[PDB]
Each structure stands twice: as C-alpha cells, then as structure tokens.
PDB file of C-alpha atoms in Angstrom:
ATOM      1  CA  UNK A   1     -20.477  13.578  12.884  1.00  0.00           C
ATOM      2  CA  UNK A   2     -17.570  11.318  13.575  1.00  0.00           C
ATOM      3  CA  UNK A   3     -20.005   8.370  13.101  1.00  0.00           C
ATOM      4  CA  UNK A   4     -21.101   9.770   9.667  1.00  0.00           C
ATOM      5  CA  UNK A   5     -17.531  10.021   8.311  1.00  0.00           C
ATOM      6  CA  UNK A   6     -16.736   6.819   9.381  1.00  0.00           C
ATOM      7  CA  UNK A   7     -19.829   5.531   6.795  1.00  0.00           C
ATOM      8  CA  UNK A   8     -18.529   7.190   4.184  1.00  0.00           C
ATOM      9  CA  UNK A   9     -15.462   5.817   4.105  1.00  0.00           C
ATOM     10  CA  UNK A  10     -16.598   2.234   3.795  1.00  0.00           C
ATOM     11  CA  UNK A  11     -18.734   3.379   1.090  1.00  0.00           C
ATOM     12  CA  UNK A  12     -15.449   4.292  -1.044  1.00  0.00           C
ATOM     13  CA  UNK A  13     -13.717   0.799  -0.022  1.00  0.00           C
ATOM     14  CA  UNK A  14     -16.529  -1.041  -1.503  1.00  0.00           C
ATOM     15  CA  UNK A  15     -15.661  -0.009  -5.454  1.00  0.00           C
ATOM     16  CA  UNK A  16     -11.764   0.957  -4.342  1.00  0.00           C
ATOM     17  CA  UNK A  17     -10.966  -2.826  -2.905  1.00  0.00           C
ATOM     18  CA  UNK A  18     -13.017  -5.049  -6.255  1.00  0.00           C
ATOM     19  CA  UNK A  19     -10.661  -5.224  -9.303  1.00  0.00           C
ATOM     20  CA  UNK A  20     -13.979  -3.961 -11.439  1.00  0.00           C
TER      21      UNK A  20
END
C-alpha cells in the first residue's frame, strides 16, 4: 500500500508544481 501512496502523491505535484 506504501507503493500506492507514494503514486498518488506525484499525481498532486504534477498540477501543484506548473504555475497553470
């Protein structure tokens, strides 16, 4: 599950790092 999370949370810096 530790994998899984791990996913997930590149998935929000994708949108959270571009200025758009």
């Amino acid at each position: 599950v530790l994998a899984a999370v791990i996913f997930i949370y590149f998935a929000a810096l994708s949108p959270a790092i571009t200025f758009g």
